[PDB]
Coordinates of C-alpha atoms and ligand atoms in Angstrom, one line a residue:
Chain A
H1 CA 92.1 92.3 72.1
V2 CA 90.0 91.5 74.8
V3 CA 90.6 90.0 78.1
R4 CA 87.4 87.8 80.3
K5 CA 89.8 85.5 81.7
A6 CA 91.9 85.4 85.0
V7 CA 93.8 81.9 86.5
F8 CA 94.3 82.9 90.5
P9 CA 97.6 80.8 91.9
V10 CA 97.0 79.4 95.2
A11 CA 98.6 76.8 95.1
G12 CA 101.8 77.7 97.2
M13 CA 102.7 75.8 100.3
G14 CA 102.8 79.1 102.6
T15 CA 105.3 78.4 104.1
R16 CA 105.6 82.1 106.0
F17 CA 102.2 82.1 107.7
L18 CA 102.9 78.5 108.7
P19 CA 100.2 76.6 111.5
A20 CA 97.9 78.9 109.9
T21 CA 98.6 78.0 106.4
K22 CA 98.4 74.3 106.9
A23 CA 96.2 73.1 105.9
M24 CA 94.9 76.6 104.2
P25 CA 96.5 78.2 101.5
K26 CA 98.3 81.8 102.4
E27 CA 95.1 83.4 99.9
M28 CA 92.4 82.3 102.4
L29 CA 93.8 84.5 105.1
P30 CA 91.6 87.3 106.0
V31 CA 91.7 91.1 106.4
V32 CA 89.4 91.3 109.5
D33 CA 86.7 89.7 107.8
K34 CA 87.2 89.3 104.0
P35 CA 90.1 86.6 102.5
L36 CA 92.7 88.2 99.7
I37 CA 91.5 86.1 97.5
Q38 CA 88.4 87.3 97.2
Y39 CA 89.4 90.8 96.9
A40 CA 91.6 89.9 93.9
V41 CA 88.7 88.1 92.0
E42 CA 86.4 91.4 92.8
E43 CA 88.8 93.5 91.9
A44 CA 89.1 91.1 88.1
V45 CA 85.3 91.3 88.5
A46 CA 84.8 94.7 88.5
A47 CA 88.0 94.8 85.2
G48 CA 85.1 92.9 83.7
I49 CA 86.8 89.4 83.9
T50 CA 83.7 86.7 83.4
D51 CA 85.5 83.4 83.5
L52 CA 87.6 82.7 87.3
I53 CA 90.3 79.8 87.0
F54 CA 91.5 79.2 90.8
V55 CA 94.7 76.6 90.7
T56 CA 94.8 74.7 94.3
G57 CA 97.0 72.7 95.1
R58 CA 96.8 70.2 98.2
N59 CA 95.0 72.8 100.2
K60 CA 91.8 73.4 97.9
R61 CA 89.2 72.5 100.2
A62 CA 89.4 76.5 101.7
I63 CA 89.4 78.2 98.1
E64 CA 86.8 75.9 97.2
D65 CA 84.2 76.0 99.1
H66 CA 85.3 79.4 99.8
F67 CA 83.9 80.4 95.6
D68 CA 81.5 77.9 95.6
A69 CA 77.7 77.3 96.8
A70 CA 77.0 76.4 100.6
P71 CA 73.3 75.4 100.0
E72 CA 73.4 74.8 104.5
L73 CA 74.4 78.0 104.9
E74 CA 71.9 79.4 102.3
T75 CA 69.5 77.5 104.8
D76 CA 70.0 78.8 108.2
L77 CA 70.9 82.0 107.1
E78 CA 67.4 82.2 104.6
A79 CA 65.1 80.7 107.8
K80 CA 66.6 83.1 109.9
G81 CA 65.8 85.8 108.7
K82 CA 69.5 87.2 107.3
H83 CA 69.2 88.1 104.6
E84 CA 71.6 91.1 104.9
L85 CA 73.9 88.2 104.8
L86 CA 72.6 85.6 102.9
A87 CA 74.5 88.4 100.0
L88 CA 77.8 88.3 101.5
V89 CA 77.7 84.7 101.1
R90 CA 75.3 84.3 98.1
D91 CA 77.1 86.9 96.3
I92 CA 80.3 86.8 96.3
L93 CA 80.2 86.7 92.8
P94 CA 77.6 88.2 90.3
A95 CA 75.9 85.7 88.1
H96 CA 76.7 86.4 85.0
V97 CA 80.8 85.1 86.4
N98 CA 82.0 81.8 86.8
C99 CA 84.7 79.7 88.1
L100 CA 86.4 76.8 87.2
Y101 CA 89.2 74.9 89.1
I102 CA 92.5 72.8 88.1
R103 CA 94.9 71.5 90.8
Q104 CA 98.2 71.3 90.1
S105 CA 100.0 68.0 89.8
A106 CA 103.5 69.6 92.6
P107 CA 103.8 72.7 93.9
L108 CA 106.8 73.5 91.5
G109 CA 106.1 77.2 91.2
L110 CA 104.0 80.0 89.5
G111 CA 105.6 79.9 85.8
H112 CA 104.4 75.9 86.4
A113 CA 100.6 77.8 88.1
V114 CA 100.6 79.8 84.9
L115 CA 101.0 77.4 82.0
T116 CA 98.8 74.7 84.0
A117 CA 95.5 77.1 83.6
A118 CA 96.5 76.9 79.4
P119 CA 93.5 73.9 78.5
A120 CA 91.4 76.2 80.3
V121 CA 92.9 79.9 78.7
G122 CA 93.1 78.5 75.2
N123 CA 94.6 81.0 72.5
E124 CA 93.3 84.0 74.7
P125 CA 95.1 86.7 76.5
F126 CA 94.7 87.2 80.5
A127 CA 95.0 87.7 83.3
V128 CA 96.5 86.8 86.4
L129 CA 96.2 87.9 89.8
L130 CA 98.2 87.5 93.2
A131 CA 96.4 87.7 95.7
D132 CA 98.6 88.2 98.6
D133 CA 99.7 91.7 97.0
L134 CA 96.3 93.6 97.8
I135 CA 95.8 96.8 96.4
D136 CA 93.8 99.5 97.9
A137 CA 92.9 102.3 94.1
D138 CA 90.3 104.1 93.8
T139 CA 90.1 102.5 89.9
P140 CA 90.2 98.7 90.0
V141 CA 94.3 97.8 89.5
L142 CA 93.2 95.1 86.6
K143 CA 91.2 98.0 84.4
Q144 CA 94.1 99.6 84.4
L145 CA 96.1 97.7 83.2
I146 CA 93.6 96.3 80.6
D147 CA 93.4 99.1 79.5
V148 CA 96.7 99.5 78.3
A149 CA 96.6 95.8 77.3
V150 CA 94.2 96.8 74.3
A151 CA 95.3 100.3 73.6
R152 CA 99.6 99.0 72.9
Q153 CA 98.4 95.9 71.6
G154 CA 100.7 93.5 74.5
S155 CA 101.3 92.1 77.6
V156 CA 101.6 94.4 80.2
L157 CA 102.8 94.2 83.6
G158 CA 101.7 95.9 86.8
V159 CA 104.9 98.1 88.7
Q160 CA 105.7 100.2 91.0
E161 CA 109.1 102.2 92.4
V162 CA 110.5 99.9 95.3
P163 CA 113.4 101.3 97.3
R164 CA 116.4 99.6 96.1
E165 CA 117.2 97.1 99.4
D166 CA 113.5 95.4 98.0
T167 CA 115.4 94.0 95.0
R168 CA 115.6 91.0 95.8
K169 CA 112.3 90.4 96.7
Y170 CA 111.1 90.7 93.3
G171 CA 110.9 90.7 89.3
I172 CA 112.3 93.6 88.5
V173 CA 112.4 95.6 84.4
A174 CA 114.2 96.5 82.6
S175 CA 112.5 99.4 80.3
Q176 CA 112.3 102.8 78.0
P177 CA 108.9 104.9 78.5
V178 CA 106.3 104.9 76.1
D179 CA 104.0 107.8 78.2
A180 CA 103.9 109.3 81.8
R181 CA 103.1 106.0 82.7
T182 CA 104.2 102.8 80.5
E183 CA 107.3 101.7 79.5
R184 CA 107.7 98.9 77.7
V185 CA 110.1 96.1 78.3
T186 CA 113.5 95.3 77.5
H187 CA 114.3 92.8 80.0
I188 CA 113.1 91.4 83.5
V189 CA 115.2 89.6 86.4
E190 CA 113.4 88.0 89.7
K191 CA 114.9 88.5 92.7
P192 CA 117.8 90.5 91.7
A193 CA 121.0 90.9 94.1
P194 CA 119.8 95.0 95.3
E195 CA 124.4 95.5 93.8
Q196 CA 122.1 93.9 90.7
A197 CA 119.0 95.0 90.3
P198 CA 118.6 97.3 86.5
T199 CA 116.9 99.8 87.8
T200 CA 113.6 99.6 90.4
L201 CA 110.6 99.2 89.1
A202 CA 109.2 96.6 89.9
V203 CA 106.7 93.8 89.2
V204 CA 103.1 93.8 91.7
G205 CA 100.7 90.4 91.7
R206 CA 99.0 91.8 88.9
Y207 CA 99.3 90.9 84.5
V208 CA 97.8 90.8 81.5
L209 CA 99.5 88.4 79.4
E210 CA 99.2 87.2 75.5
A211 CA 99.0 83.1 75.1
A212 CA 102.0 83.1 73.9
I213 CA 103.4 82.7 76.4
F214 CA 102.3 79.7 77.4
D215 CA 104.5 78.5 74.9
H216 CA 107.6 79.5 76.7
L217 CA 106.7 78.5 80.0
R218 CA 107.5 75.0 78.2
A219 CA 111.0 76.1 77.3
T220 CA 111.4 77.8 81.0
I221 CA 109.4 77.2 86.3
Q222 CA 109.5 80.6 86.6
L223 CA 106.9 82.7 85.4
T224 CA 109.6 86.1 85.2
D225 CA 111.9 83.7 83.3
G226 CA 108.5 83.1 80.5
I227 CA 108.4 86.3 80.2
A228 CA 111.9 87.6 80.0
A229 CA 111.8 85.3 76.4
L230 CA 108.7 86.3 75.7
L231 CA 110.1 89.9 75.4
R232 CA 112.2 88.6 72.8
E233 CA 109.7 87.7 70.3
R234 CA 106.2 90.0 71.2
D235 CA 105.4 93.2 73.3
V236 CA 105.7 93.5 77.2
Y237 CA 105.3 96.5 78.5
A238 CA 105.4 98.0 82.4
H239 CA 102.9 99.7 83.9
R240 CA 102.9 102.1 86.4
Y241 CA 99.7 101.5 88.0
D242 CA 97.5 103.9 90.8
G243 CA 96.7 102.9 94.0
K244 CA 98.4 101.3 97.1
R245 CA 99.8 98.7 97.2
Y246 CA 100.2 96.0 100.4
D247 CA 102.7 92.8 100.1
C248 CA 100.3 90.5 101.8
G249 CA 103.9 87.5 101.7
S250 CA 105.7 88.6 104.5
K251 CA 103.9 88.4 108.1
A252 CA 104.9 91.6 108.8
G253 CA 103.5 92.6 105.0
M254 CA 100.0 91.4 106.3
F255 CA 100.3 93.0 110.3
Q256 CA 100.7 96.4 108.0
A257 CA 97.4 95.8 106.0
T258 CA 95.5 94.9 109.4
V259 CA 96.1 97.9 110.7
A260 CA 95.6 100.5 107.8
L261 CA 92.8 98.5 106.4
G262 CA 91.4 98.7 109.6
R263 CA 91.5 101.9 110.5
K264 CA 90.4 103.6 107.1
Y265 CA 87.6 100.9 106.2
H266 CA 86.5 99.2 109.6
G267 CA 87.6 102.0 111.8
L268 CA 90.4 99.4 113.7
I269 CA 92.1 101.9 115.4
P270 CA 94.7 100.1 118.4
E271 CA 95.1 100.7 122.3
Chain B
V1 CA 93.7 63.7 136.9
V2 CA 92.8 66.3 134.0
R3 CA 94.2 65.2 130.8
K4 CA 91.0 65.5 128.4
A5 CA 89.6 68.5 126.1
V6 CA 86.5 69.7 124.8
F7 CA 86.8 72.1 122.2
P8 CA 84.0 73.3 120.6
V9 CA 84.5 74.4 117.3
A10 CA 81.7 75.3 115.4
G11 CA 81.3 79.4 115.8
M12 CA 79.1 80.1 112.7
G13 CA 81.0 83.6 113.4
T14 CA 78.6 85.4 111.3
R15 CA 79.9 88.6 112.5
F16 CA 83.0 88.1 110.8
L17 CA 81.3 86.8 107.6
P18 CA 82.6 86.2 104.2
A19 CA 86.2 84.9 105.7
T20 CA 84.0 82.0 108.0
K21 CA 82.2 81.1 105.0
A22 CA 84.8 77.6 104.2
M23 CA 86.3 76.9 107.7
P24 CA 84.6 77.3 111.7
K25 CA 85.1 80.7 113.5
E26 CA 87.9 79.0 115.2
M27 CA 90.5 78.5 112.5
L28 CA 90.9 82.4 112.2
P29 CA 94.4 83.4 112.7
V30 CA 95.7 86.0 115.5
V31 CA 98.8 87.2 113.7
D32 CA 100.5 83.7 112.3
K33 CA 97.9 80.5 114.5
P34 CA 94.8 79.5 114.3
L35 CA 92.1 80.4 117.1
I36 CA 91.5 77.1 117.9
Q37 CA 95.8 76.7 118.1
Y38 CA 96.2 79.1 121.0
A39 CA 93.7 76.6 122.8
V40 CA 95.0 73.6 122.1
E41 CA 98.5 74.6 123.2
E42 CA 97.4 76.0 126.5
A43 CA 95.7 72.7 127.2
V44 CA 98.9 71.1 125.7
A45 CA 101.5 73.1 128.0
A46 CA 98.9 72.0 131.2
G47 CA 99.3 68.7 130.4
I48 CA 95.6 67.8 128.7
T49 CA 96.9 64.1 126.4
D50 CA 93.1 63.9 124.4
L51 CA 92.2 66.6 122.7
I52 CA 88.4 66.3 121.9
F53 CA 86.8 68.6 118.5
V54 CA 82.8 68.9 118.7
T55 CA 82.7 70.0 114.9
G56 CA 80.1 72.1 112.8
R57 CA 80.2 73.0 108.8
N58 CA 83.8 73.1 107.4
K59 CA 84.6 70.1 110.0
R60 CA 87.5 69.4 108.2
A61 CA 89.3 72.0 107.6
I62 CA 89.8 71.3 111.2
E63 CA 90.9 68.4 110.9
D64 CA 93.2 69.3 107.9
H65 CA 94.7 71.4 110.8
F66 CA 95.4 68.3 112.9
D67 CA 96.1 65.4 111.2
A68 CA 99.5 64.5 109.9
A69 CA 99.8 65.4 106.2
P70 CA 102.4 63.3 105.0
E71 CA 102.1 65.5 101.4
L72 CA 103.7 68.4 103.9
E73 CA 106.5 66.7 105.6
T74 CA 108.1 64.8 102.5
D75 CA 107.8 68.9 100.4
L76 CA 109.7 70.1 103.2
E77 CA 111.8 68.0 104.0
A78 CA 113.5 67.5 100.6
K79 CA 113.8 71.4 100.2
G80 CA 115.9 71.1 103.7
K81 CA 113.1 73.1 105.6
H82 CA 113.9 71.0 108.9
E83 CA 112.5 74.2 111.6
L84 CA 109.3 74.1 109.4
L85 CA 108.8 71.4 109.7
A86 CA 109.2 70.6 113.5
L87 CA 107.0 73.8 113.0
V88 CA 103.9 71.5 111.7
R89 CA 104.8 68.4 113.6
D90 CA 104.2 70.4 116.9
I91 CA 100.3 71.1 115.8
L92 CA 100.0 68.2 117.3
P93 CA 102.9 67.4 119.7
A94 CA 103.7 63.4 119.5
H95 CA 102.7 62.3 123.0
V96 CA 98.8 63.9 122.2
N97 CA 96.3 62.7 119.7
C98 CA 92.7 63.5 118.5
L99 CA 89.9 62.9 117.9
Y100 CA 86.2 64.3 116.1
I101 CA 82.7 64.3 116.8
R102 CA 79.6 66.1 114.9
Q103 CA 77.5 67.8 116.8
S104 CA 73.9 67.4 115.7
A105 CA 72.5 70.5 115.5
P106 CA 73.2 74.8 117.6
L107 CA 71.6 73.4 120.2
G108 CA 73.9 75.2 122.4
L109 CA 77.0 74.9 124.1
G110 CA 75.4 72.5 127.1
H111 CA 74.6 70.4 124.1
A112 CA 78.3 70.4 122.3
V113 CA 79.3 69.3 126.1
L114 CA 77.2 67.1 126.0
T115 CA 78.3 65.7 122.8
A116 CA 81.7 64.8 124.1
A117 CA 79.5 62.9 126.8
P118 CA 80.6 59.4 125.1
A119 CA 84.5 59.8 124.4
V120 CA 85.2 61.3 127.6
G121 CA 83.0 59.2 130.4
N122 CA 84.1 59.0 134.1
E123 CA 87.0 61.0 134.2
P124 CA 86.9 65.5 134.3
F125 CA 87.4 67.1 131.9
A126 CA 89.2 70.2 130.6
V127 CA 86.4 72.9 128.3
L128 CA 88.0 75.6 126.6
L129 CA 86.7 78.4 124.2
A130 CA 88.8 79.0 120.9
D131 CA 87.4 83.0 121.0
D132 CA 88.8 83.7 124.4
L133 CA 91.6 83.9 123.8
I134 CA 94.3 83.9 127.2
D135 CA 97.8 85.5 126.9
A136 CA 98.8 83.8 130.2
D137 CA 102.8 83.6 132.1
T138 CA 101.2 80.3 133.6
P139 CA 99.1 78.1 130.7
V140 CA 95.2 79.2 132.4
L141 CA 94.3 75.2 132.2
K142 CA 97.2 74.8 134.7
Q143 CA 95.8 77.3 136.4
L144 CA 92.5 75.9 136.8
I145 CA 93.4 72.7 137.1
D146 CA 95.8 73.4 140.2
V147 CA 92.5 74.4 141.8
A148 CA 90.1 71.8 140.7
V149 CA 92.5 68.8 142.4
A150 CA 93.5 70.5 144.8
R151 CA 89.4 71.7 146.2
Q152 CA 88.3 68.2 144.5
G153 CA 85.4 69.6 142.5
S154 CA 84.5 71.2 138.5
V155 CA 86.5 74.8 138.3
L156 CA 85.5 77.9 136.4
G157 CA 87.5 80.1 135.0
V158 CA 85.9 83.8 136.1
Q159 CA 87.2 87.9 135.6
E160 CA 85.5 90.5 136.6
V161 CA 83.0 92.5 133.8
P162 CA 81.6 95.8 133.6
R163 CA 77.8 95.3 134.8
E164 CA 77.1 97.2 131.7
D165 CA 78.4 94.1 129.9
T166 CA 76.8 90.7 132.0
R167 CA 74.3 89.8 128.7
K168 CA 77.1 88.9 127.3
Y169 CA 78.3 85.9 130.4
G170 CA 77.7 83.8 132.9
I171 CA 77.4 85.7 135.6
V172 CA 78.2 83.3 139.5
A173 CA 77.2 83.8 142.7
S174 CA 79.3 83.3 145.0
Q175 CA 81.4 83.2 148.3
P176 CA 85.5 83.9 148.9
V177 CA 87.4 80.5 149.8
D178 CA 91.2 82.4 148.7
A179 CA 92.5 84.9 147.4
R180 CA 91.5 83.6 144.2
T181 CA 88.9 80.6 144.4
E182 CA 85.3 81.3 145.6
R183 CA 82.9 78.4 146.1
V184 CA 79.9 78.8 143.8
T185 CA 76.6 78.5 144.6
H186 CA 74.3 80.3 141.7
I187 CA 74.8 80.3 138.3
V188 CA 72.5 82.5 136.1
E189 CA 72.6 82.8 132.3
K190 CA 73.1 86.1 130.6
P191 CA 71.4 88.6 133.1
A192 CA 69.7 91.4 132.2
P193 CA 72.0 95.0 134.0
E194 CA 69.6 95.5 136.7
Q195 CA 69.5 91.9 137.7
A196 CA 73.0 90.4 137.6
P197 CA 74.1 89.0 141.4
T198 CA 77.2 90.2 140.9
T199 CA 79.4 90.9 138.2
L200 CA 81.4 87.8 138.2
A201 CA 81.7 86.5 134.8
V202 CA 82.7 83.0 132.8
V203 CA 85.4 83.4 130.7
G204 CA 85.3 79.7 127.9
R205 CA 87.5 77.9 130.9
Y206 CA 86.0 74.6 132.3
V207 CA 87.7 72.0 134.3
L208 CA 84.4 70.0 134.8
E209 CA 83.5 66.4 136.5
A210 CA 81.8 64.0 134.6
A211 CA 78.3 64.2 136.6
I212 CA 77.7 67.3 134.3
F213 CA 76.4 65.4 131.7
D214 CA 73.6 63.6 133.4
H215 CA 72.8 67.5 134.4
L216 CA 73.4 68.1 130.6
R217 CA 71.1 65.1 129.6
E218 CA 69.0 70.7 130.3
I219 CA 70.7 72.4 127.1
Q220 CA 72.1 75.3 127.4
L221 CA 75.9 74.8 129.8
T222 CA 74.8 77.0 132.3
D223 CA 72.1 74.6 133.8
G224 CA 74.2 71.9 134.0
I225 CA 76.6 73.6 136.0
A226 CA 73.1 75.3 138.4
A227 CA 71.9 71.6 138.6
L228 CA 75.7 70.2 139.6
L229 CA 75.5 72.6 142.0
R230 CA 72.8 70.4 144.3
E231 CA 75.5 67.8 144.6
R232 CA 79.3 68.5 143.8
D233 CA 81.4 71.1 144.8
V234 CA 82.4 74.1 141.8
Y235 CA 84.6 76.7 142.6
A236 CA 85.5 79.8 140.3
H237 CA 88.9 81.0 140.3
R238 CA 90.2 84.2 138.9
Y239 CA 92.8 83.3 136.6
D240 CA 96.2 85.5 136.0
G241 CA 96.6 86.3 132.5
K242 CA 94.8 88.9 129.7
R243 CA 91.9 87.0 128.2
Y244 CA 91.0 88.9 124.3
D245 CA 87.7 88.5 123.2
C246 CA 87.5 87.5 120.2
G247 CA 84.3 87.1 119.2
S248 CA 84.1 90.6 118.3
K249 CA 86.2 92.3 114.6
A250 CA 87.4 94.7 117.6
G251 CA 88.6 92.5 119.8
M252 CA 90.5 90.1 117.3
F253 CA 92.0 93.3 115.9
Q254 CA 93.1 94.0 119.4
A255 CA 94.6 90.7 120.0
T256 CA 96.4 90.7 116.8
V257 CA 97.7 93.8 117.6
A258 CA 99.0 93.4 121.6
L259 CA 100.6 89.7 120.4
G260 CA 101.9 90.5 117.2
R261 CA 104.5 92.9 119.4
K262 CA 105.2 91.1 122.4
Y263 CA 105.3 86.9 120.1
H264 CA 106.7 89.3 117.0
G265 CA 108.1 92.0 116.9
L266 CA 105.3 94.1 114.9
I267 CA 104.2 97.9 115.3
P268 CA 101.8 99.5 113.3
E269 CA 103.6 101.7 111.4
Ligands
UPG1 O1 103.8 76.1 92.9 C1 102.8 77.1 93.3 C2 103.7 78.1 93.6 C3 103.4 79.3 93.6 N1 102.3 79.4 93.2 C4 102.0 81.1 93.2 O2 102.1 81.6 92.9 C5 102.4 82.7 94.0 C6 103.4 83.4 94.4 O3 104.9 83.2 94.3 P1 106.0 83.3 94.7 O4 106.6 83.1 93.9 O5 105.9 83.1 96.4 O6 105.7 84.9 94.5 P2 106.9 86.0 95.8 O7 108.5 86.4 96.2 O8 105.8 87.2 95.7 O9 107.1 86.2 93.6 C7 106.1 86.5 92.4 O10 105.6 88.5 93.1 C8 105.9 89.2 92.8 C9 104.7 89.9 92.8 O11 104.3 90.1 94.4 C10 106.8 89.8 91.4 O12 107.8 90.7 91.6 C11 106.9 88.5 91.5 O13 108.1 88.5 89.6 C12 106.7 87.0 91.1 O14 107.5 85.7 90.5 C13 101.4 82.9 95.1 O15 99.7 83.4 94.2 C14 101.5 81.6 95.1 O16 99.9 80.9 95.7 C15 101.1 78.3 93.0 O17 100.3 78.8 92.5 N2 102.0 76.9 93.1
UPG2 O1 75.2 76.3 119.1 C1 76.3 76.6 119.9 C2 77.0 76.9 120.1 C3 77.7 77.7 120.7 N1 79.2 76.6 119.8 C4 80.6 76.7 120.3 O2 80.3 77.4 121.6 C5 81.4 78.6 121.6 C6 80.3 79.7 122.0 O3 78.8 79.3 122.4 P1 78.4 80.5 123.2 O4 77.5 80.3 123.4 O5 77.7 81.0 121.6 O6 79.0 81.4 124.1 P2 78.8 82.9 124.6 O7 78.3 83.7 123.8 O8 80.3 84.2 124.8 O9 78.6 81.9 126.4 C7 79.1 81.4 126.5 O10 81.0 81.9 126.9 C8 80.7 82.9 127.9 C9 82.2 83.4 128.4 O11 83.2 83.6 126.8 C10 80.4 82.2 129.2 O12 79.8 83.6 129.6 C11 79.0 81.7 128.7 O13 78.6 81.0 129.9 C12 78.7 81.0 127.7 O14 77.1 80.7 128.2 C13 82.5 78.7 120.7 O15 83.4 77.4 121.5 C14 81.4 78.0 119.5 O16 82.2 77.5 118.6 C15 79.0 76.0 119.9 O17 79.7 74.8 119.4 N2 77.3 75.3 119.1
MG3 MG1 103.8 87.1 97.0

């Protein structure tokens, strides 16, 4: 089991952040001075990912230009002696990491975006990271999940408990415990009503998936329904990662991430 | 009489890298809206119909924001999301137009303004710097335009600043003509505190007569305004409104907090 490829779906419409997402993916919005997608990419690279796969939509321009070289910007900075800032631009990706881009044909859903990556993944297990789940963790959450996936020989979903009123926001798993932090998944259901949700254990935007998922995404698109079918055929585990998740998919969550991370890592204090 | 506005949108925002690697500084959002869109909405609210964007790196970030995107409108309308479709169409109101001109190189605000001359022609025009995010009950540009038409001259938006801050601003020497407006007799660019003639600073709002263009053919805007002073009337106006200096991370944060509260109900936990 070797997980070296990561898929970043960044092709959604971003309607909760209009007008800012008119011509920019939601994942390119900054938290202070860094786009959401760069936090997630940095986490993946720290977890041993070498092959980055960006699934883009009509707003691909900003994602491409963020991770590709900007020789004109580097020329300027280099000329003005700003070697400090030069690294912020050219060293976003270390040299042992590569990226590629695949355009999702239409915004047909997260499951369809993951399936769109199949030509670059092949028959390899792979990571999926949803950058609007911004996670502050002392050990990269993706690394935590990859270690479980290697040890237990299966797919792994990052999960954490949520208030029962919040189940309508998330995929919710039914499972049976395996150790303190890990459970074997017996069902997953997307955004159930709180009165119907089988548990309050919710999927965060971090996945390690066996390539078997792709055939199920063809016969499904919602990613959660592909996973629920994968269950019937292979092992899927849910892991309670250590870390603080900010749900930046809403204006409110992004705001509280700016406040909390602004304070902790930048000393930004509300007046 | 003022219906054209120039928006320099070439900011490198080096203090905001890597966020500004792929978009100009003026595209960064405060809550859910790019800085440039606050400034454009202020201009449109003041009767501006012709938007003139002076671009630099990542020019299509600005263009794709303001240009219609039929693909997006087609998808929203098909999903019955009619409030969101109207929001997207209001980014550029139907009576408003915009055009794009490239700055040849980063030669300062004065060069950027001069770059807009072919689009402005001989009429008076506004300049708005999107990093100065101003929240006011009456649009600040409207306040300045009203003064310009009344007094038949150019108008600089000003506010008092700490003397220790004058190296950040253009500073005006001037004589009161009414409670909020002064007649400018001199302007100096970013003086040392110990040599600043006053503490009355120009913020990023201008209403300028087209005569400025010949005086800029002087690379700094303050030097152009000082030459314009020898031939035409220039006033400074203490606008009413709260300015957020979004040129620093600290200032942009205070704008997110304050406007988050006022316009979106968002309260720090
Ligand atoms: O056509 C599309 C639609 C979405 N996206 C991307 O998909 C992600 C978000 O998809 P969306 O379906 O809006 O996600 P959520 O509603 O937050 O729910 C997902 O993410 C949650 C974790 O945040 C999980 O609990 C849910 O099970 C899972 O479906 C983002 O990366 C988007 O860029 C695409 O690339 N293409
Ligand atoms: O080569 C350049 C430099 C700047 N800009 C744009 O011009 C504005 C800011 O220019 P800069 O000269 O860096 O502004 P400040 O240092 O804030 O000073 C200007 O703005 C102040 C108000 O904030 C005034 O007091 C000053 O007189 C005036 O020079 C932004 O819209 C930039 O995108 C360009 O397009 N090209
Ligand atoms: Mg989300």
